[PDB]
């Protein structure tokens, strides 16, 4: 009943998105990224990166302008649809580690983000005459990955959003966030704050003061995971689920940060026992890393759902 997210797009020479959509246990898949954000990026149109994938072309503003906004992404566009006829979510993710430059400058332009990405990503509709980077397909939410620059605007998209999938009510659509694990998180814990998100994944890798393996030793730092079920309580996001964010191999994250199935085993025991209404699972970064890391004949998110479902 517990869910298995994992991140996709920017694995070194990765596997097409379809072959995961093949992977019995994964429950979301969130492709990333949508790492150009409009008030700096060329055109002010959006942009992305999905590593290996995808042909190379951008699209151009109406005025000529080249923006960063890949135009061919075939495989994506053939392979989304794999993943939701076997009924897994497909969230867009905004942000990502790279660059390290981009933020949200004004509400404006905050609404205006969310609205392209909706006209984009979202439903076709007829008063759309902008770009449709996966064609005719529609993703099923967006993910907030922010890693760089602070906190602003993002309440305001997530609203924007909401506002948006509460017009198409035959559809539920899903929001999400991946802050890491410092709290206040300075990139999100404003929004998580000021808007209601489905899913949280906190990122327990690379902060040594609070990662899952100081769960396991507990000398390293203390392992927050009850913090953020308390900083819940008082925000928008109340009713979110929050998800154990993992390293899928030994070098997917900083070293030190990796957990053995069987340690993952001792940590979800306890906080699945003890939060059985917010513990939403887990997540994984990232695909390519979990396939390459094999144990016992399966990829480390096969282990992962066993854990979940034990």
Not at 27 to 50: A, C, E, Q, T
Not at 146 to 153: C, L, Q, R, T
Not at 264 to 291: C, H, K, N, Q
């Amino acid at each position: 009943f517990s869910n298995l997210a994992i991140y996709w797009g920017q694995g070194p020479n990765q596997l097409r998105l379809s072959h995961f959509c093949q992977e019995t246990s994964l429950d979301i898949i969130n492709i990333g990224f949508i790492n150009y954000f409009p008030d700096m990026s060329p055109g002010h149109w959006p942009g992305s990166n999905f590593g290996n994938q995808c042909d190379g072309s951008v699209y151009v503003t109406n005025d000529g302008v080249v923006t960063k906004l890949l135009s061919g992404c075939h495989q994506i566009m053939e392979d989304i649809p794999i993943c939701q006829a076997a009924g897994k979510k497909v969230l867009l993710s905004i942000g990502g580690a790279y660059p390290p430059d981009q933020s949200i400058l004004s509400e404006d332009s905050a609404v205006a983000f969310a609205t392209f990405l909706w006209g984009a990503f979202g439903p076709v509709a007829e008063g759309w005459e902008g770009p449709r980077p996966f064609g005719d397909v529609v993703v099923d939410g967006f993910d907030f990955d922010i890693e760089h620059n602070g906190g602003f605007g993002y309440a305001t998209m997530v609203n924007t959003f909401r506002q948006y999938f509460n017009q198409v009510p035959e559809r539920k659509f899903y929001l999400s966030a991946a802050p890491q694990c410092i709290i206040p998180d300075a990139q999100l814990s404003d929004a998580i704050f000021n808007a209601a998100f489905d899913f949280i994944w906190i990122q327990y890798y690379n902060t040594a003061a609070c990662s899952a393996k100081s769960f396991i030793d507990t000398s390293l730092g203390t392992f927050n995971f009850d913090a953020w079920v308390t900083v819940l309580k008082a925000s928008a996001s109340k009713d979110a689920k929050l998800y154990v964010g993992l390293p899928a191999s030994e070098t997917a994250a900083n070293q030190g940060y990796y957990l053995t199935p069987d340690e993952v085993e001792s940590l979800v025991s306890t906080y699945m026992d003890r939060y059985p209404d917010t513990f939403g699972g887990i997540m994984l970064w990232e695909a390519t890393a979990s396939e390459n890391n094999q144990i016992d004949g399966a990829p480390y998110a096969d282990h992962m759902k066993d854990i979940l479902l034990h």
